Design an enzyme around this catalytic site. Structure first.
Site, mmCIF file in Angstrom:
data_model
loop_
_atom_site.group_PDB
_atom_site.id
_atom_site.type_symbol
_atom_site.label_atom_id
_atom_site.label_comp_id
_atom_site.label_asym_id
_atom_site.label_seq_id
_atom_site.Cartn_x
_atom_site.Cartn_y
_atom_site.Cartn_z
ATOM 1 C CB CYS A 1 -0.931 -0.061 1.248
ATOM 2 S SG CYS A 1 -1.886 1.459 1.510
ATOM 3 C CB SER B 1 -0.184 3.713 4.207
ATOM 4 O OG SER B 1 -1.292 4.486 3.766
ATOM 5 C CG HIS C 1 2.710 7.753 2.914
ATOM 6 N ND1 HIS C 1 3.136 8.328 1.789
ATOM 7 C CD2 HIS C 1 1.334 7.808 2.890
ATOM 8 C CE1 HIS C 1 2.109 8.736 1.078
ATOM 9 N NE2 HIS C 1 1.012 8.407 1.758
ATOM 10 C CG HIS D 1 -1.177 -1.410 6.351
ATOM 11 N ND1 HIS D 1 -0.147 -0.908 5.652
ATOM 12 C CD2 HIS D 1 -2.375 -0.981 5.768
ATOM 13 C CE1 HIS D 1 -0.667 -0.198 4.660
ATOM 14 N NE2 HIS D 1 -1.997 -0.257 4.724
ATOM 15 C CB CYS E 1 -5.488 -1.561 3.482
ATOM 16 S SG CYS E 1 -5.293 0.256 3.497
HETATM 17 N N1 LIG Z 1 -7.738 6.874 4.474
HETATM 18 C C1 LIG Z 1 -7.291 5.616 4.579
HETATM 19 O O1 LIG Z 1 -7.676 4.795 5.405
HETATM 20 C C2 LIG Z 1 -6.240 5.143 3.574
HETATM 21 C C3 LIG Z 1 -6.110 3.781 3.290
HETATM 22 C C4 LIG Z 1 -5.249 3.355 2.279
HETATM 23 C C5 LIG Z 1 -4.450 4.282 1.605
HETATM 24 N N2 LIG Z 1 -4.525 5.628 1.966
HETATM 25 C C6 LIG Z 1 -3.777 6.686 1.254
HETATM 26 O O2 LIG Z 1 -4.398 6.965 -0.002
HETATM 27 C C7 LIG Z 1 -3.440 7.479 -0.925
HETATM 28 C C8 LIG Z 1 -3.436 6.604 -2.166
HETATM 29 O O3 LIG Z 1 -2.927 5.291 -1.851
HETATM 30 P P1 LIG Z 1 -2.561 4.293 -3.049
HETATM 31 O O4 LIG Z 1 -1.959 3.098 -2.442
HETATM 32 O O5 LIG Z 1 -3.736 4.175 -3.939
HETATM 33 O O6 LIG Z 1 -1.398 5.119 -3.781
HETATM 34 P P2 LIG Z 1 -0.689 5.055 -5.217
HETATM 35 O O7 LIG Z 1 0.649 5.646 -5.132
HETATM 36 O O8 LIG Z 1 -0.857 3.701 -5.745
HETATM 37 O O9 LIG Z 1 -1.579 6.085 -6.070
HETATM 38 C C9 LIG Z 1 -1.385 7.473 -5.949
HETATM 39 C C10 LIG Z 1 -1.804 7.957 -7.321
HETATM 40 O O10 LIG Z 1 -1.817 9.376 -7.268
HETATM 41 C C11 LIG Z 1 -1.215 9.868 -8.463
HETATM 42 N N3 LIG Z 1 -0.771 11.262 -8.261
HETATM 43 C C12 LIG Z 1 0.338 11.693 -7.651
HETATM 44 N N4 LIG Z 1 0.420 13.035 -7.679
HETATM 45 C C13 LIG Z 1 -0.658 13.390 -8.337
HETATM 46 C C14 LIG Z 1 -0.953 14.706 -8.639
HETATM 47 N N5 LIG Z 1 -0.242 15.697 -8.125
HETATM 48 N N6 LIG Z 1 -2.080 14.879 -9.327
HETATM 49 C C15 LIG Z 1 -2.843 13.860 -9.686
HETATM 50 N N7 LIG Z 1 -2.554 12.588 -9.407
HETATM 51 C C16 LIG Z 1 -1.444 12.337 -8.717
HETATM 52 C C17 LIG Z 1 -0.136 8.862 -8.741
HETATM 53 O O11 LIG Z 1 0.254 8.918 -10.117
HETATM 54 C C18 LIG Z 1 -0.825 7.562 -8.413
HETATM 55 O O12 LIG Z 1 -1.523 7.017 -9.542
HETATM 56 C C19 LIG Z 1 -2.112 7.456 -0.194
HETATM 57 O O13 LIG Z 1 -1.869 8.723 0.416
HETATM 58 C C20 LIG Z 1 -2.329 6.424 0.902
HETATM 59 O O14 LIG Z 1 -1.501 6.698 2.038
HETATM 60 C C21 LIG Z 1 -5.440 6.051 2.919
HETATM 61 ZN ZN LIG Z 2 -3.082 0.931 3.313
#
Ligand SMILES: NC(=O)c1ccc[n+]([C@@H]2O[C@H](COP(=O)([O-])OP(=O)(O)OC[C@H]3O[C@@H](n4cnc5c(N)ncnc54)[C@H](O)[C@@H]3O)[C@@H](O)[C@H]2O)c1
Ligand SMILES: [Zn+2]
Ligand SMILES: NC(=O)c1ccc[n+]([C@@H]2O[C@H](COP(=O)([O-])OP(=O)(O)OC[C@H]3O[C@@H](n4cnc5c(N)ncnc54)[C@H](O)[C@@H]3O)[C@@H](O)[C@H]2O)c1
Ligand SMILES: [Zn+2]
Ligand SMILES: [Zn+2]
Ligand SMILES: [Zn+2]
Lengths: 374, 374
Positions: free
Chosen positions: A46, A48, A51, A67, A174
């Site tokens: 993921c 996160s 991060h 996780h 997740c």
């Molecule tokens: N709220 C929650 O419980 C929860 C759970 C899981 C993941 N997350 C978070 O959600 C976010 C996404 O997770 P993921 O695993 O899908 O990430 P990921 O890296 O797979 O996807 C992020 C996407 O955003 C795009 N991106 C980056 N900068 C951009 C910009 N400036 N403009 C437009 N698009 C842009 C990237 O190209 C990528 O496709 C992360 O911050 C992650 O930490 C939160």
């Molecule tokens: Zn996650």
């Protein structure tokens, strides 16, 4: 047999920030009362977990991260009644203790026993179960799934269907539940609406899946990596926009496209600027914008409160608003009954020993979700 | 008699920011098609009228301000079907054109024909009906009630009961319906909840009245002016807290008092720090915070998006979320049916001529609502 003894096994330890994971041998103590020791079968990568490596999400180091996963119970500590050895399970990074103010509220899900707002990196009793090179190693959000074995508290584990394909349902731990629940439970997308989704990674593609299931008439995907667009259209996006193609700010484009604002927008990246852009492009009198992305530690955004005075709603949520232990079993059952697909999200499957390669795929933008197998 | 002719009458003109209102003789042109000319009977002094004087709410000057009012139709232009001469009416600063997307939407009320997001200060056709010393004077939110006569568009006027006490029900034109609807319609306060209300002026006390009508078990009024506490308790506050009595931030005080955060908080002042403080004191996983106060023009607040990620909901609204033309007649009928009191909010009734005295009462903290009668 291993019940009652220390297991020595491999795990991916992050000794320092911004370093590769070091695959090495660790010692995993037996479970204490109400803890459960799990043999990991599959774990997803993921954003996160990346991060943590970059210092965006602060948790005590050295740590075994991970996780989003699924495995099989190897042993249970005294007092455990909800799982037994041999059960298939998904570790919960958001616990459901069932006793706190949030668990007894009908709508909240961010249980007060979580280790995400003030991270200690320990079990619920303040200690660790991991030792590597004689040093204690921290846990990550009570899960720590980048290890062949891990120990979690009972309130952080849910028993799932014994027929579940673990190399697929780990994403319910997740990415999938988060994106799906942000659309159908948190924003409550209505039949016929226009939705905009910022970020088309694993969790953003799950948000598009939830909007399609709630009957949205138009779903605009937004990403700067145009290679994500074919997959976005495949799971439900009606059109995709790359902010870099335009000379005007994207909230302008999105407001002109949806004829004055979308009904629902979702920020699924984790940047402060796109959170404010996602709010601005929903309709000013009745739009709803949901933050899903994890922002950099301790940084503040700046915005103009008239964006809310006209009637907009702004909200965020952890794990798609789902009470974890209640929902995860029912989401695996719906997967089993073919109510949604997980396969579009899995682009790569690698052995655990290739974890660093998996992270480079994420960082280079080549994968959506990589599953690591043990 | 006056129908079809220009009327010369007195109106309070604001010639410049931070100056007193000038009582002048102005000429009020007759109603054009779909406009209505009203003889004013009573108008309240709302803090948004003082925001025009201080430069907080920017609108074209010179202007005749005033927007919370009730009067009698003196003549109607061609094509008006919803009122007739002799009807008691309340002008609507938020119109209901009935045809735009917000009007057609079941929940939004901020009609697109409003003059509040980008104020031109004109009638719907781009012209003014007011002249003073040969100069055109701007309208304010299509209402301009600090004048013996005013002209409004038909989409900005509601016909009310002929037996209405106009000197009481002018509060439904703004302060009362805003505070009451912010609680029962925008935040949707639940029976048994704990609410906290930042700001105990006319609108803040109408929020306490909606929370009590919705069944809140605890309503904490917060104000730095302890003289407002008596009236707050009179209309429903269970306790009042003054920030200056404390050595620690009031967000910590209110989170301690409510055992982890309130269910609903309301900002009813208009300050960027209390908007962030009101959001932080509601429970992190399921609390709702509603901004009612008008913030200072062009200023940004700063906040940490982790306050939303945990589950909070932040919303704002104009006029309590009510569709104005549909709702105002109905709230007058309910007032007639003794369903809510307006008298606790009126502390001073002055002749229209003493308008600046009424503004000084507000600014010194001695009045809740002063009604000016014509
Ligand atoms: N709220 C929650 O419980 C929860 C759970 C899981 C993941 N997350 C978070 O959600 C976010 C996404 O997770 P993921 O695993 O899908 O990430 P990921 O890296 O797979 O996807 C992020 C996407 O955003 C795009 N991106 C980056 N900068 C951009 C910009 N400036 N403009 C437009 N698009 C842009 C990237 O190209 C990528 O496709 C992360 O911050 C992650 O930490 C939160
Ligand atoms: Zn996650
Ligand atoms: N959203 C809408 O449609 C709408 C409608 C009407 C009024 N308003 C706005 O609502 C706000 C309140 O209007 P009102 O007429 O009731 O105003 P008011 O001046 O009567 O009341 C303001 C109250 O806030 C208190 N206050 C000031 N600073 C404070 C602080 N630092 N901490 C705590 N309390 C503080 C004052 O003592 C006063 O009691 C104004 O900003 C007004 O412009 C908005
Ligand atoms: Zn709990
Ligand atoms: Zn007002
Ligand atoms: Zn309209």
């Amino acid at each position: 047999s291993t019940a009652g003894k220390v297991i020595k096994c491999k795990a991916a330890v992050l000794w320092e920030e911004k370093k590769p994971f070091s695959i090495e041998e660790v010692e995993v103590a037996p479970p204490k009362a109400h803890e459960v020791r799990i043999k990991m079968v599959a774990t997803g990568i993921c954003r996160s977990d990346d991060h943590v490596v970059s210092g965006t999400l602060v948790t005590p180091l050295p740590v075994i991260a991970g996780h989003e996963a699924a495995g099989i119970v190897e042993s249970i500590g005294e007092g455990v009644t909800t799982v037994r050895p041999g059960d298939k399970v998904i570790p919960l990074f958001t616990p459901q203790c069932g006793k706190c103010r949030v668990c007894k509220h009908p709508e909240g899900n961010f249980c007060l026993k979580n280790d995400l707002s003030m991270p200690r990196g320990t079990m619920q009793d303040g200690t660790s179960r991991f030792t590597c090179r004689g040093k204690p190693i921290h846990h990550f959000l009570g899960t720590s799934t980048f290890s062949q074995y891990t120990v979690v508290d009972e309130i952080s584990v849910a028993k799932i269907d014994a027929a579940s394909p673990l190399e697929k349902v780990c994403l319910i731990g997740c990415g999938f539940s988060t994106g799906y629940g942000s659309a159908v439970k948190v924003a409550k997308v209505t039949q016929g609406s226009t939705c905009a989704v910022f970020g088309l990674g694993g969790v953003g593609l799950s948000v598009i899946m939830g909007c399609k299931a709630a009957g949205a008439a138009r779903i605009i995907g937004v990403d700067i990596n145009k290679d994500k667009f074919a997959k976005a259209k495949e799971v439900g996006a009606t059109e995709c926009v790359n902010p870099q193609d335009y000379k005007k700010p994207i909230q302008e484009v999105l407001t002109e496209m949806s004829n004055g604002g979308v009904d629902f927008s979702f920020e699924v990246i984790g940047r402060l600027d796109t959170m404010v852009t996602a709010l601005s492009c929903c309709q000013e009198a009745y739009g709803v914008s949901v933050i899903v992305g994890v922002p950099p530690d301790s940084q503040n955004l700046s915005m103009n409160p008239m964006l809310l005075l006209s009637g907009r709603t702004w909200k965020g949520a952890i794990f798609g608003g789902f009470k974890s232990k209640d929902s995860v079993p029912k989401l695996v059952a719906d997967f089993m009954a073919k109510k949604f697909a997980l396969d579009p999200l899995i682009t790569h499957v690698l052995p655990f020993e290739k974890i660093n390669e998996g992270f480079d795929l994420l960082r280079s933008g080549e994968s959506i979700r990589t599953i690591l197998t043990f």
